[PDB]
Amino acid sequence: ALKRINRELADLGKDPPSSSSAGPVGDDLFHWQATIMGPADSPYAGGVFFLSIHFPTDYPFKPPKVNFTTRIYHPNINSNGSICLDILRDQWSPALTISKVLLSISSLLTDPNPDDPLVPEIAHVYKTDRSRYELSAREWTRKYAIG
Amino acid sequence: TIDEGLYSRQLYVLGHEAMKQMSQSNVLIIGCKGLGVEIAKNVCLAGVKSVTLYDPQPTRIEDLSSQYFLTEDDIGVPRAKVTVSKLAELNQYVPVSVVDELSTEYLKNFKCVVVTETSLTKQLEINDFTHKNHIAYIAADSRGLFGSIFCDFGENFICTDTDGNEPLTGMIASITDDGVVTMLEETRHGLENGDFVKFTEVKGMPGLNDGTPRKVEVKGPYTFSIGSVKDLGSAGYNGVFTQVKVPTKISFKSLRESLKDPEYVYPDFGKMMRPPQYHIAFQALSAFADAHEGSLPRPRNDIDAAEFFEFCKKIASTLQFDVELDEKLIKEISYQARGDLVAMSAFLGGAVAQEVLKATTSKFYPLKQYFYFDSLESLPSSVTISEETCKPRGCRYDGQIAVFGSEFQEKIASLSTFLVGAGAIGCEMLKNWAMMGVATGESGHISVTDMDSIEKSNLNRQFLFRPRDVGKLKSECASTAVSIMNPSLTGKITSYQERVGPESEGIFGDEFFEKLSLVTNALDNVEARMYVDRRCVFFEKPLLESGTLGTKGNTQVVVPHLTESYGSSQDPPEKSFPICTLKNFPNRIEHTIAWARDLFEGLFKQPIDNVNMYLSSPNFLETSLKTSSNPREVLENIRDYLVTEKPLSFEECIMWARLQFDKFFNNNIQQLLFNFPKDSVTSTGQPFWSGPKRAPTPLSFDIHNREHFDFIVAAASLYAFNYGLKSETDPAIYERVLAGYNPPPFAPKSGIANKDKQELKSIADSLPPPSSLVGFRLTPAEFEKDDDSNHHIDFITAASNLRAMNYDITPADRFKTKFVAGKIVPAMCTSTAVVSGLVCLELVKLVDGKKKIEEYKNGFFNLAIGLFTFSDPIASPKMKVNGKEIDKIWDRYNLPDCTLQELIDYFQKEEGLEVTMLSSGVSLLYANFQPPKKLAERLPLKISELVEQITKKKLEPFRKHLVLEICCDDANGEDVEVPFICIKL
């Protein structure tokens, strides 16, 4: 629990994630505010996305609650920030670190998964009109993910 | 006609058909001592047709050792006559009678016959009749720390269900022409060899949909074989299989035939040579009683022990038993012949009542046939047990003194226990403590806490409560009832109405917890169990945990500095479905039930909360515009529930219900099909709506349909409740109002500055000012499953069934919907009795202060299959710190309220460890990677002041200690775990 969380925090401090920066909110060890940089080879380039992580009391036996804060135009992310990630609902096991979760979310941002979407309209736009999806993603990542 | 308001929890264990067959059966009980009264109580709570008692023996004082329906004013009255009046109140659907004389032919009037405290000749006479006439015969006996059960249901007993598990069902991926059936990806069927399954909704092989059972040949965890399906087809795609359970025939033997060649059931595998000893010993007890005018051997008497052993030798010679008699164990049985313990009585009564239910309902696998049990590890060793100490003293504890002695009675009488919870297990534990005489001395005390109130469904398994007590607090009623049972507990019991948690530390603090002797948990949730476990670990108090689930049960004992704590073991977590499965692509009824619950909350609870908060908080809009995830949603909810769609009559509520039907069952499905048509393909070329995704279809509102009408009624009623209007149920008004409805046109939409902020402001200004509406509040709908007049479960069932009709899922009835939505845990009275008996058998070990870890037994049992097992507790892990042996769980550092720098230097010098992290609760007090300025600002502060500053909350006046978690590294840099720190304020 607390000891594992502090070990993860020290690992983050010792080895910088470069593309990510997670840390406790204030001085609470069960509430973290992480930052993800938009991948270069993605419509979200040049953007900063903030995520809120709530560690459960039974951590690591239960998955942390990761929710987006910045608005994002993605097929697998809805307006409330919920993420359709398998490792956070029922595939969670006490062997995954927060750096792994952030890397998985970055990979998800690199390429969406429209075959099993969470926002059907965005997935339909992505599958049918790719250029319009790109334009909308750039517009959103500039209106909300910058400044 | 089954009263589901009372048998709600029991029907989830037995079922409707089982209880229907159970409510037509008569049970006769011979013997009304502690075991007999326990069996009768459990049977009356179960719900059999009637119970008849037969016990003309006059009451004696020692009979009060386990009979809780007898008082000291009843000495000299037949036990049945004074027990029937108190038994007739447990259940109003089960009449209780008494027969003065018993004839053999009279036995034809009953379905089951239970025999206790009867000689072997009379048992043979009764069984020689009840065998040939197909009458179930159960015989039970309890001698001190030993017990025996015998079951004989006839030579042609038919058992429909042999394990109590739900039929195995699953979804299929493909079926080959050779019968090889494969499950979906990463799905296990769970079938075994020799099972029969039926296939439904199978595409490509319609012949498999007839329902004829077929053999199952398991080939792996994911695939099995069904045989030859060549004639029906070549390959089958998808489908759902369901296991078929066939009845089994069990043939029992009579008592006379089974005396010579018994068939034992072993409750433990560490001692499998004992049941043969007990078989001889109990018959020797019967012979000794017959040869001494029904007088059992005197407690701890050597002459009677020798005579009993001679009888045992004679019996072993007569029956051609080629087993060497163990003199020590047999003489132990002789010594405790006159014992009467409430724990053994409760355990055996629960088991025997379950056997009675098996006999009546023809369900579950029964004992076949002899079951001999002993708990001899509970015999005290730190006190003197002899003939002088165990002689009767003419008090109600004679049955227990005859086993434990007077010194152990004095040890029990000065206990100071703490019972958390007052549920079924709590009531049983209180009864056992009252009978045992716990906390009846000068220094004894009992404390019981529970914050819940008595409901109707709790009366089925919590026998200390009555229908007149519905709505009252559990702790007060339980304390009053147990004070009535044992008048010596008047003033020795304190009842609280506090929830045990972080907020109750002002009452259950150091002063309260330093006077206890042990803590017993009777909770039903894991969070409270973990909290109480942490408190007991910190204060070093013994803990007794016990849990039940239907017919399964377990008991665990936690001993300071000896065994591991409750939290050291992890249980399987609850399964939560993915959000994308619930939102768009459900394939099971549970997904639709979860979606219906979410819809209920989002329609009748959250918008009402937003409207109430807007009318109460003067600055709600500004906070919401920059705090809430979707401020536009909040503004739209406020506008719709205040001005746009505020009903003025129930007709407008009906119109709103129809509109919501269109919104959630006709338009969203159209939009989803517009996004992903039925003929769409994935990126890999496979069809989209294949496998776990089912193609939906919009519903057209038909008033004549039952589900549509039920949804309309429930939604309109809930909306009227939100607005406090007068709801109606006559179909005439619904049919008249909904006739003249014009559905607004809807076509799916493809999509294609601060203007939006301006529009949000536009909505903002249109809202009425808070001053215009003062005292106006909308009533939210708080979910309540147990009440059937609030239209909560009705709405959830209607919505779930409608969404199932959207996705062609098989709808479920209101019973299963209430089971799933309400998270109802199945519960039984027999399981509660068994767990209480086991816990009270461990309590006497705790009182005696046994030191070895092999003398304690964690227990597990499953009454559906007659399985009992006992295993030693796991020892607490050890560790090496600074070349010393440290207990991981039961050790701590005791330090004064020194400054942070002093604490770090102390750990550097004494333990030779460098502190790298120090936290208290959920706050990080000190870390090695923090910037130097912050540390230099925090170093010279005391621990209490540091905690107050970081947590921004002053320490309470009753706080007397701080528990700190510290992570420190060795000199070489290797991380080494250390026990927590206890700062004394």
Ligand SMILES: Nc1ncnc2c1ncn2[C@@H]1O[C@H](COP(=O)(O)OP(=O)(O)OP(=O)(O)O)[C@@H](O)[C@H]1O
């Ligand atoms: N944290 C807690 N502190 C104190 N008492 C608790 C706590 N959690 C649960 N309890 C009590 O534990 C008892 C559990 O008993 P039980 O589960 O049989 O009853 P119930 O939950 O009211 O009934 P049911 O689950 O059958 O609807 C209840 O009295 C409940 O009030």
Ligand SMILES: [Mg+2]
């Ligand atoms: Mg309750």
Ligand SMILES: [Mg+2]
């Ligand atoms: Mg409960």
